[PDB]
Homo-oligomer: A and B are copies of this chain.
Amino acid sequence: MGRVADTIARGPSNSEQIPALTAVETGHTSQVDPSDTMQTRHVHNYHSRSESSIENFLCRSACVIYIKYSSAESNNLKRYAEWVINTRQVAQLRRKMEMFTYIRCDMELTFVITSHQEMSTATNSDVPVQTHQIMYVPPGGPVPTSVNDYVWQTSTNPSIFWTEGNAPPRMSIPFMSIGNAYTMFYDGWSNFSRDGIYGYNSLNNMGTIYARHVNDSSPGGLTSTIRIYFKPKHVKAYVPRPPRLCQYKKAKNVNFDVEAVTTERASLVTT
């Protein structure tokens, strides 16, 4: 297992060994212990670095979008979802994955689907329990264009059917990428002319998740909302990066606005 290094005792010294002096004119950072600048005592130290792994750091579920869709078209919600998969909508899950240049992992998608009735003029409203379909179209497939069409037959597309009141539905998505790891920062362009889309959005192409109410519309109608949650598993993350300092602007770019390094102080010397 993993545990912190023990502190080891030393007496006073008065030798020609200098641990304290170093030159940080090299990438080599100092390796000094607190057993090299003062005497210390033997402390058998039982602390574990067990929550600072990259499979405890990244391995908690986090929301990545919500899509709303309606059974009567409440106010520009259509009757089906649609959402081109990326991790860039949020600033939570996104930030932790932009702290590494490359990550390979196996997600678990968990959906949390809830509904609420609309304002409507319908009276004597009783609806049976809703069933929702969540279909995943890998890129280049056919895309639905209406609530009912042939695309929702799910002839080979992965699809989840779920009825309200049951536990949130989840599934695992294996590591699926052209690369040998997902790329979180791409410095290239789509074209060889250095034209078109620039950045990580060039490589992003993970398909689209649609969803709809299976049930034919009731008179009152409802508005459902689906919240997608990704939880990495089996994570190997290569090449670390300084975490973001700036608020994001866009989900396809890194554009940023210039921001302060740190919060103010009164002066150099502050208690």
Contacts and interface: CB of A to CB of B under 8 A. Distances in A.
Interface in A59-99: 60-63, 90-93, 96
A155 interface: yes
A68 to B, nearest CB: 9
27 contacts: A60-B155, A61-B154, A62-B153, A63-B153, A63-B155, A90-B153, A91-B150, A92-B150, A92-B153, A92-B155, A96-B155, A112-B131, A112-B161, A114-B214, A115-B128, A115-B215, A116-B128, A116-B216, A116-B218, A117-B126, A117-B127, A117-B128, A122-B124, A123-B124, A125-B126, A128-B130, A129-B165
A33 interface: no
Contacts of A156: 60, 62
Q: How many copies does the complex hold?
A: 3
B215 A116 contact: yes
Contacts of A112: 131, 161, 214
Interface string A155-193: 110000101110010000000000000000000000000
Given A112-B161, A116-B128, A123-B124, 18 more contacts: A62-B153, A62-B155, A63-B153, A90-B153, A114-B216, A115-B215, A116-B215, A116-B216, A117-B128, A117-B218, A117-B219, A122-B124, A124-B124, A125-B126, A126-B126, A128-B164, A129-B164, A163-B165
